[PDB]
Coordinates of C-alpha atoms in Angstrom, one line a residue:
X20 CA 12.9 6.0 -3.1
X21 CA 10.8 4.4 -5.8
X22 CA 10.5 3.9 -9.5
X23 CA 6.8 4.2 -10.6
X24 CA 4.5 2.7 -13.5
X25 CA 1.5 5.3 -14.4
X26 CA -1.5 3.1 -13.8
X27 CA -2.9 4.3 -17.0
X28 CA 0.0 1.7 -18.4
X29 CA -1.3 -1.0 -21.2
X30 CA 0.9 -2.8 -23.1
X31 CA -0.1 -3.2 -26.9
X32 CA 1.4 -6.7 -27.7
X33 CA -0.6 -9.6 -25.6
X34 CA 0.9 -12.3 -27.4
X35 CA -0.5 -14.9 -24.9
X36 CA 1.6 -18.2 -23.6
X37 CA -0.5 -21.9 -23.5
X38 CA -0.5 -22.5 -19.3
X39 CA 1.0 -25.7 -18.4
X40 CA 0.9 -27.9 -15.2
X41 CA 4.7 -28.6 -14.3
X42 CA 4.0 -31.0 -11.2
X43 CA 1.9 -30.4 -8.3
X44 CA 1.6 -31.3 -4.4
X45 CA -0.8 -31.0 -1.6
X46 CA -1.0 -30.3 2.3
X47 CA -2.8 -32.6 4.0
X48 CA -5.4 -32.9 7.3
X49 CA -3.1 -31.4 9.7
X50 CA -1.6 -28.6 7.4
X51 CA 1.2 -30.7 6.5
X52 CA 2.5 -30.9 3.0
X53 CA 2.8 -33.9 0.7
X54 CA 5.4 -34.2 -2.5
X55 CA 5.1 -38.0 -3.5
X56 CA 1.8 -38.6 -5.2
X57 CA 0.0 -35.6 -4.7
X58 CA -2.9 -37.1 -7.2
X59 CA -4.1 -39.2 -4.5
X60 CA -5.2 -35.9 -3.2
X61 CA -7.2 -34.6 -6.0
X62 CA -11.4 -34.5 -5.6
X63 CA -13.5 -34.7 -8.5
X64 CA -17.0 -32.8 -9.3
X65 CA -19.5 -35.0 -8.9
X66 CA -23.2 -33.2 -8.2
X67 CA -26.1 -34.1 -10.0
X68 CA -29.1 -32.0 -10.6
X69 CA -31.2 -34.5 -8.8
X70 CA -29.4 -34.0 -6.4
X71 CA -29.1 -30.0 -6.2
X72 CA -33.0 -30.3 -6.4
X73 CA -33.3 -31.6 -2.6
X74 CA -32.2 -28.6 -1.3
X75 CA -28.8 -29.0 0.4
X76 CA -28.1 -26.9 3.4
X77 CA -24.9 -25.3 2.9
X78 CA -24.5 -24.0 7.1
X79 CA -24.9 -28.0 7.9
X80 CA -21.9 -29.0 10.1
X81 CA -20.9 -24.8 10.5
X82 CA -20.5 -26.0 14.4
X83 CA -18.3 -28.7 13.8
X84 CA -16.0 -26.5 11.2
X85 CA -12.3 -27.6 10.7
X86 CA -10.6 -24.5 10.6
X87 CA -7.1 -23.5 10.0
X88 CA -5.9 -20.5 11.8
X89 CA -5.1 -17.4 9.5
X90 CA -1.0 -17.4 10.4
X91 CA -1.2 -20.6 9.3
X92 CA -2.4 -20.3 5.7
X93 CA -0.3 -17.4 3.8
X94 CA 0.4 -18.8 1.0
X95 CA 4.3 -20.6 2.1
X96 CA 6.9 -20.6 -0.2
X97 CA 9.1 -23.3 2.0
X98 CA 6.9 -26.2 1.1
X99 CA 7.0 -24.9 -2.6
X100 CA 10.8 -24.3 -3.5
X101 CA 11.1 -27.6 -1.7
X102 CA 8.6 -28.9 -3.6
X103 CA 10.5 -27.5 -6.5
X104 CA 13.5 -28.8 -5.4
X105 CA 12.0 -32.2 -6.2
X106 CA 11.1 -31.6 -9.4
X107 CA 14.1 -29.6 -10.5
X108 CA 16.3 -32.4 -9.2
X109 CA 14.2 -34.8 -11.2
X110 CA 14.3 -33.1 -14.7
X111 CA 18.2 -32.5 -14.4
X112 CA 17.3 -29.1 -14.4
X113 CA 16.1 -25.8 -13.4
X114 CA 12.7 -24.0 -14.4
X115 CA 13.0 -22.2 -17.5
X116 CA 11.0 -19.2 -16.0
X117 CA 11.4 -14.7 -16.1
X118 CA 9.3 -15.1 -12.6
X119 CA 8.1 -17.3 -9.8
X120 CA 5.5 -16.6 -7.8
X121 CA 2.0 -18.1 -6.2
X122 CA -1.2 -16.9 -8.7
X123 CA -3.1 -15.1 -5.8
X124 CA -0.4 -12.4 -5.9
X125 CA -1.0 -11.8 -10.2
X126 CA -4.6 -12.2 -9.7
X127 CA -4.5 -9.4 -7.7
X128 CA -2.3 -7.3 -10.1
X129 CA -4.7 -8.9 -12.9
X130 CA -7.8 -7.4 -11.3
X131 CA -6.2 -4.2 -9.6
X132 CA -7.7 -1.8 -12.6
X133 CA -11.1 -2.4 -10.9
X134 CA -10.4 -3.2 -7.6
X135 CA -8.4 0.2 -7.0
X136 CA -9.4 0.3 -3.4
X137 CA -7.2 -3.0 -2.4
X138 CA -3.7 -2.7 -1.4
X139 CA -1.1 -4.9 -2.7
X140 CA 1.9 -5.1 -0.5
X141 CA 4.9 -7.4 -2.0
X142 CA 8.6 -8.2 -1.8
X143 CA 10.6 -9.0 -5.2
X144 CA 13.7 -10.8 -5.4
X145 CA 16.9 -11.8 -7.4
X146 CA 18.4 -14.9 -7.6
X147 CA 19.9 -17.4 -10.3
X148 CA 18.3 -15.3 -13.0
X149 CA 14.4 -15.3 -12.4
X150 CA 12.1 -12.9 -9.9
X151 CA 10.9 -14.6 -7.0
X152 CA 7.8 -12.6 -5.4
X153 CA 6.0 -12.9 -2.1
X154 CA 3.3 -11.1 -0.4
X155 CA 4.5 -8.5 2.7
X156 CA 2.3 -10.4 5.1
X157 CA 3.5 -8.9 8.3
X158 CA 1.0 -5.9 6.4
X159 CA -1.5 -9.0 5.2
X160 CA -2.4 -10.2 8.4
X161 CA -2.6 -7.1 10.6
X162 CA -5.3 -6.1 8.0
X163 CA -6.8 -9.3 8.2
X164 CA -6.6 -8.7 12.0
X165 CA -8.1 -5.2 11.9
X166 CA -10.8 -5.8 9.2
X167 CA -11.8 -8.3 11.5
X168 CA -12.1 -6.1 14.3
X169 CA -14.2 -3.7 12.4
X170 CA -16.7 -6.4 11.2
X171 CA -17.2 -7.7 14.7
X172 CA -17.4 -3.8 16.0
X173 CA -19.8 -2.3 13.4
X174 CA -22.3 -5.0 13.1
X175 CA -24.7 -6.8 15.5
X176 CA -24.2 -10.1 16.8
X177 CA -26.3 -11.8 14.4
X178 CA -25.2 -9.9 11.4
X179 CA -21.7 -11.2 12.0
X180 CA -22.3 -15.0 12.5
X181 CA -24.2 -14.4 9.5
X182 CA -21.3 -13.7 7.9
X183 CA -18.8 -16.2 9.3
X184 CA -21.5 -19.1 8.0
X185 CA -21.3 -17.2 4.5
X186 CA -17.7 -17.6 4.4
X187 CA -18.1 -21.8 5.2
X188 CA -20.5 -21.8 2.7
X189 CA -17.9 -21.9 0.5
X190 CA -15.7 -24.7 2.4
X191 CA -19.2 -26.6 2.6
X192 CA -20.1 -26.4 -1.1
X193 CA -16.4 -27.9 -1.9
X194 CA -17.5 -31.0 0.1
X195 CA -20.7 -31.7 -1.0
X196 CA -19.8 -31.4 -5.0
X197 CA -16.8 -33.4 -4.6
X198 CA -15.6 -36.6 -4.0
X199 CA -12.1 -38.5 -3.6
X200 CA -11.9 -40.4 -6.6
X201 CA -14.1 -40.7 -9.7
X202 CA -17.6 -42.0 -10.2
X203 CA -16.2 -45.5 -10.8
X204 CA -14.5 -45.8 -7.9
X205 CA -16.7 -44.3 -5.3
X206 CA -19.5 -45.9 -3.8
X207 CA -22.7 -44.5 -3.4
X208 CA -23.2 -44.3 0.3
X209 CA -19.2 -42.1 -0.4
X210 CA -21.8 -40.1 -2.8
X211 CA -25.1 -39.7 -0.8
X212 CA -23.1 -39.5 3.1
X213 CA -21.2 -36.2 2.5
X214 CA -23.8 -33.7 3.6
X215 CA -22.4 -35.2 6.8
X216 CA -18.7 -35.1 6.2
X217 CA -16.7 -33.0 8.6
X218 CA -16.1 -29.4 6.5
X219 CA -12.0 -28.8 6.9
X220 CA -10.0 -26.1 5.0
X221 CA -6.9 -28.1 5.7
X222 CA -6.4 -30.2 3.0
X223 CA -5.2 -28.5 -0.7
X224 CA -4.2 -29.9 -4.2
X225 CA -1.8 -27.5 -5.5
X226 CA -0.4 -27.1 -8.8
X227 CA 2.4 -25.4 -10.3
X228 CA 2.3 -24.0 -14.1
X229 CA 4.4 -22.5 -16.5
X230 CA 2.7 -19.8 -18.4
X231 CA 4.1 -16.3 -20.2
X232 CA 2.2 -12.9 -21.3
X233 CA 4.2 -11.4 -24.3
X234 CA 7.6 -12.0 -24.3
X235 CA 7.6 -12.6 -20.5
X236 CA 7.5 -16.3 -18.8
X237 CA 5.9 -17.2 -15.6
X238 CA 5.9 -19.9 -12.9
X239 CA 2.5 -19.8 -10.9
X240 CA 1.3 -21.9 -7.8
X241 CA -2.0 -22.1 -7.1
X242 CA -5.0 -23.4 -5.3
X243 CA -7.0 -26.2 -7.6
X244 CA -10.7 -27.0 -6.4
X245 CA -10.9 -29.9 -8.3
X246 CA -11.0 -32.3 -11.2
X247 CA -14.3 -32.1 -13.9
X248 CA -14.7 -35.1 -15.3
X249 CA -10.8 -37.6 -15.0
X250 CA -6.8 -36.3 -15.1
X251 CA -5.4 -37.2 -18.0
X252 CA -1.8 -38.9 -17.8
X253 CA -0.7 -37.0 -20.6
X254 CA 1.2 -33.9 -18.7
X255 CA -0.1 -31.1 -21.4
X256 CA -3.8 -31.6 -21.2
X257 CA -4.3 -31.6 -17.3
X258 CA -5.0 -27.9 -16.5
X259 CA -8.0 -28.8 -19.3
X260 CA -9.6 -30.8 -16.8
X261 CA -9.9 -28.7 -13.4
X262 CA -12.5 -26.6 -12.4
X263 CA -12.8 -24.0 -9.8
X264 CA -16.1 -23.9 -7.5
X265 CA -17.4 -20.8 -5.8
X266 CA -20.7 -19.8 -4.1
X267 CA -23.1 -16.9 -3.9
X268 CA -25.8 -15.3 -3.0
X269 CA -28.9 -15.4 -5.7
X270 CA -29.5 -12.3 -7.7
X271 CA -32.6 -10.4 -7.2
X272 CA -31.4 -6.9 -8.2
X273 CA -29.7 -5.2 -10.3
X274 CA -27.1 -4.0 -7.2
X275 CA -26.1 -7.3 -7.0
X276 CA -26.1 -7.7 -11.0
X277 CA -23.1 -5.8 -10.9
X278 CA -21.8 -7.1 -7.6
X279 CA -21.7 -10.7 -9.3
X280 CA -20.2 -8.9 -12.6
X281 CA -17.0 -8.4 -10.1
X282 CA -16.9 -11.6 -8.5
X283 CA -17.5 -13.0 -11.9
X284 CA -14.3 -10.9 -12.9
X285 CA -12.4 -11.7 -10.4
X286 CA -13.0 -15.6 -10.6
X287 CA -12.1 -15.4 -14.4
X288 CA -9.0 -13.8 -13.2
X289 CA -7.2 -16.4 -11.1
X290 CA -8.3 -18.8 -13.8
X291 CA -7.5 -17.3 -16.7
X292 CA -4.0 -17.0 -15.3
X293 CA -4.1 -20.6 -14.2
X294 CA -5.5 -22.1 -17.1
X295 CA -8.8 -23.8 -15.4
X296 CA -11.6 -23.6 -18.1
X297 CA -14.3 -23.9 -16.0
X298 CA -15.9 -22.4 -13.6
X299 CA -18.9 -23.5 -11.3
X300 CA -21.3 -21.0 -8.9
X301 CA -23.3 -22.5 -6.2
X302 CA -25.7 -20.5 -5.7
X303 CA -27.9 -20.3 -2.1
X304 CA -30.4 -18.2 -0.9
X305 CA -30.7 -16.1 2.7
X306 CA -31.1 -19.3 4.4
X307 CA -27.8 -20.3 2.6
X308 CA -29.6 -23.4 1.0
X309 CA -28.4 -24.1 -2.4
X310 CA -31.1 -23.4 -5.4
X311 CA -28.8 -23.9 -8.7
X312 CA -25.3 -24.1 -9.8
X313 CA -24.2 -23.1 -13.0
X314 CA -21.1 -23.5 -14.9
X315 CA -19.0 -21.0 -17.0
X316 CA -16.5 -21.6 -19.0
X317 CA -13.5 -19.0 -18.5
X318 CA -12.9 -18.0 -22.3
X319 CA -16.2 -17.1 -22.5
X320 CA -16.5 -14.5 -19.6
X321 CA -15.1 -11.7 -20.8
X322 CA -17.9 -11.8 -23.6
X323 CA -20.3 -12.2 -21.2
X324 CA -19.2 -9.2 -18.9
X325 CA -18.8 -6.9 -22.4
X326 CA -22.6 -7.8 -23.5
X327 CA -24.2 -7.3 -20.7
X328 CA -26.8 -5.2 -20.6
X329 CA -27.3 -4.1 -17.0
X330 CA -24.1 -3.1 -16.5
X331 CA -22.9 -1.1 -19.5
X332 CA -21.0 1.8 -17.5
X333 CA -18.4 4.4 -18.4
X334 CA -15.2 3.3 -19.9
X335 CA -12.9 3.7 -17.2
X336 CA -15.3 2.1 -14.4
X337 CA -16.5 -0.8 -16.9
X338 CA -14.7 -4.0 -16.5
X339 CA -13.0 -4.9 -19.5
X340 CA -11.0 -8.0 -19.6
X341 CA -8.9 -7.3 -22.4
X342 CA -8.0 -4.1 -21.0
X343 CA -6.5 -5.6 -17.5
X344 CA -4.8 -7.9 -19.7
X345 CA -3.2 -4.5 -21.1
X346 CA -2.3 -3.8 -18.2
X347 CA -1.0 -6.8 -16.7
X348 CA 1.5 -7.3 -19.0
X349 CA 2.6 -3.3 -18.9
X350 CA 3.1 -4.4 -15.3
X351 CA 4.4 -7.8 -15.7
X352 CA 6.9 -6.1 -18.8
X353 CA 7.9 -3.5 -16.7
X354 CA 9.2 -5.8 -13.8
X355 CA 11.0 -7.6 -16.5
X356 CA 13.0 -4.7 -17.8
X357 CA 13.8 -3.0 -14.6
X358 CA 15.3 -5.2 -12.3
X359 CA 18.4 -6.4 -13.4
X360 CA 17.9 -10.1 -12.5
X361 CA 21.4 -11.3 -11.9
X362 CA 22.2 -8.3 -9.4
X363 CA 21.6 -10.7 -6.5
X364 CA 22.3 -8.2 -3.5
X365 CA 19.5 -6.3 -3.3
X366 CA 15.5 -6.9 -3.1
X367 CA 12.5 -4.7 -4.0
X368 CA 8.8 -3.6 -3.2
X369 CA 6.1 -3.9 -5.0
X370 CA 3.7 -1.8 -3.6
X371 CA 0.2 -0.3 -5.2
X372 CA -1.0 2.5 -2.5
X373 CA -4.3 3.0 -3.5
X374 CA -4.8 6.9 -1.2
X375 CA -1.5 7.9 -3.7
X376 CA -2.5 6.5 -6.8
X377 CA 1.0 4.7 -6.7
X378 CA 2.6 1.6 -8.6
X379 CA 6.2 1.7 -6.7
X380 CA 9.2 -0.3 -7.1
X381 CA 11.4 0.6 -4.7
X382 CA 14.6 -1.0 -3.4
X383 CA 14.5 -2.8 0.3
X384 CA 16.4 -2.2 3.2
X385 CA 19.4 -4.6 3.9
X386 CA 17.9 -6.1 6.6
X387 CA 14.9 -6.8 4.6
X388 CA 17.1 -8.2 1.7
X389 CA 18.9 -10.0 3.8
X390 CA 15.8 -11.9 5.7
X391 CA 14.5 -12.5 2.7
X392 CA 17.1 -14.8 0.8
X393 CA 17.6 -16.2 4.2
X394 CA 14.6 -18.2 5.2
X395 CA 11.9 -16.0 4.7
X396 CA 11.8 -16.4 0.7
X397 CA 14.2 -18.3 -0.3
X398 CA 15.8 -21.2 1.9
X399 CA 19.2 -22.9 2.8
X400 CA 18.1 -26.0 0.8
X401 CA 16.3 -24.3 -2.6
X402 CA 19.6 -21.7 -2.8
X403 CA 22.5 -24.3 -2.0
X404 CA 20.6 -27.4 -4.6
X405 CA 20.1 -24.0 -7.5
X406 CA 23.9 -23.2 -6.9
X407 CA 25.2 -26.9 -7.3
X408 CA 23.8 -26.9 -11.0
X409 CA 26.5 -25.2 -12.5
X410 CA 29.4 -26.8 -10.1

């Protein structure tokens, strides 16, 4: 039996909380994670209009595609609480946080007003005074699994590899922006060679951040692309410095006018609640060569999506970022006065059902609680170290 939040929620107060990186780590070739100098593992931008003007071929390499398997990339909160662990140990002390959680799973939440079709299927949990939140991924991947199925079934055998080279365009564009270390340090055989480079999806630079909405505080661990320009030492001013790259198709109509107004949306999303201010688009044609990239800067998005003229629409089907703010932190509020926090014996479910127009928290089985705080969550290690602070 559930508690439920009418999705027409919006909080009024969006007193908004400066993100900040807190540490970060990586995983590496082989999908194995890394704690001790995780900067050795951060790319930097580094793509020149000259360059973008020879026409780079974004399905070069598709064959010869690194690829990690699906089970093996939900988002894994072992090598992050031990990550944490580190850094806990380290600053004598634990998080100050209300929540901790990877970003995917509030980017989601973030962007649900408009994306009302999309499940969201997630477990909530108690412990040493902060929510921990994962994503149900038993549900995850046997969607994954069956939209899949679907995509292979309902479309010809072209229109599907089609498709499966789209989604590399992505991984391929990362490799041919970036490179290991800055400009200075990089020489330019490095620079001009990568249109060769192996494509992986192996390797990752996460970072963790404090950030609050209201009077609520926030741990988030996300996915960072890259670096724009150098990493400051100084520990405030890094998130000022990533961007985020993403690819698509050039527009031609106004269909897909308003198909890139949601992407746009949803990109400004994760970074807004990460902190990156900027944003780069590749963009490639049929042929999935790249024709132009362009950069956006995230505080400047929501004006953008607002003055459009194309895509003025009615009030309740025109994105407004403002007004999923609203609603984020109705959600984010609500999770924040309903659980009692230090009740440590039971779990919850976060579950938006988008057939039943429902935002349910509901309690877990016992089982499920248990399984949870028990290796599936939370783990021997991260429990016993948070328990022998106050000892």
């Amino acid at each position: 039996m559930a508690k439920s939040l009418p999705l027409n929620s919006r909080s009024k107060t969006t007193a908004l909380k400066q993100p900040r990186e807190l540490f970060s780590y990586a995983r590496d070739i082989d999908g194995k994670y890394v704690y001790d100098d995780p900067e050795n593992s951060l790319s930097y931008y580094y793509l020149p209009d000259s360059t973008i003007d020879t026409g780079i071929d974004l399905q070069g390499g598709y064959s010869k595609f690194k690829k990690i398997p699906d089970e093996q990339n939900l988002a894994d909160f072992n090598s992050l609480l031990k990550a944490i662990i580190k850094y806990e140990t380290s600053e004598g002390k634990k998080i100050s946080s209300d929540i901790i959680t990877f970003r995917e799973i509030m980017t989601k939440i973030l962007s649900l007003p408009y994306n009302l079709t999309d499940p969201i299927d997630l477990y909530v949990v108690p412990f040493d005074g902060q929510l921990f939140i994962k994503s149900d991924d038993e549900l995850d991947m046997k969607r994954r699994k069956e939209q899949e199925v679907r995509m292979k079934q309902t479309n010809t055998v072209e229109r599907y590899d089609y498709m499966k080279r789209c989604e590399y365009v992505g991984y391929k564009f990362e490799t041919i922006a970036t490179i290991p270390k800055p400009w200075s340090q990089v020489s330019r055989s490095q620079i001009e060679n990568r249109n060769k480079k192996v494509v992986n999806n192996y390797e990752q630079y996460l970072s963790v951040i404090r950030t609050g909405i209201g009077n609520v505080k926030l741990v988030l661990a996300g996915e960072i692309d890259c670096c724009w320009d150098y990493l400051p030492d100084e520990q405030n001013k890094k998130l000022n410095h990533y961007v985020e790259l993403k690819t698509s198709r050039i527009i031609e109509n106004n269909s897909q006018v308003v198909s890139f107004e949601q992407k746009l949306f949803k990109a400004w999303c994760q970074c807004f609640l990460m902190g990156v201010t900027k944003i780069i688009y590749g963009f490639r044609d049929n042929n999935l060569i790249l024709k132009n990239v362009e950069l956006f800067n995230t505080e400047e998005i929501p004006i953008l999506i607002k003055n459009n003229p194309l895509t003025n629409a009615a009030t309740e089907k025109k994105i407004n970022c403002t007004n999923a703010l609203k609603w984020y932190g109705a959600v984010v509020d609500w999770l924040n006065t309903t659980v009692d926090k230090k009740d440590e014996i039971k779990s919850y479910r976060l579950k938006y059902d988008p057939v039943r127009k429902s935002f349910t928290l509901s309690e877990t089985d016992s089982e499920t609680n248990e399984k949870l705080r028990n290796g599936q969550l939370l783990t021997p290690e991260f429990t016993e170290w948070r328990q022998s602070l106050k000892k």
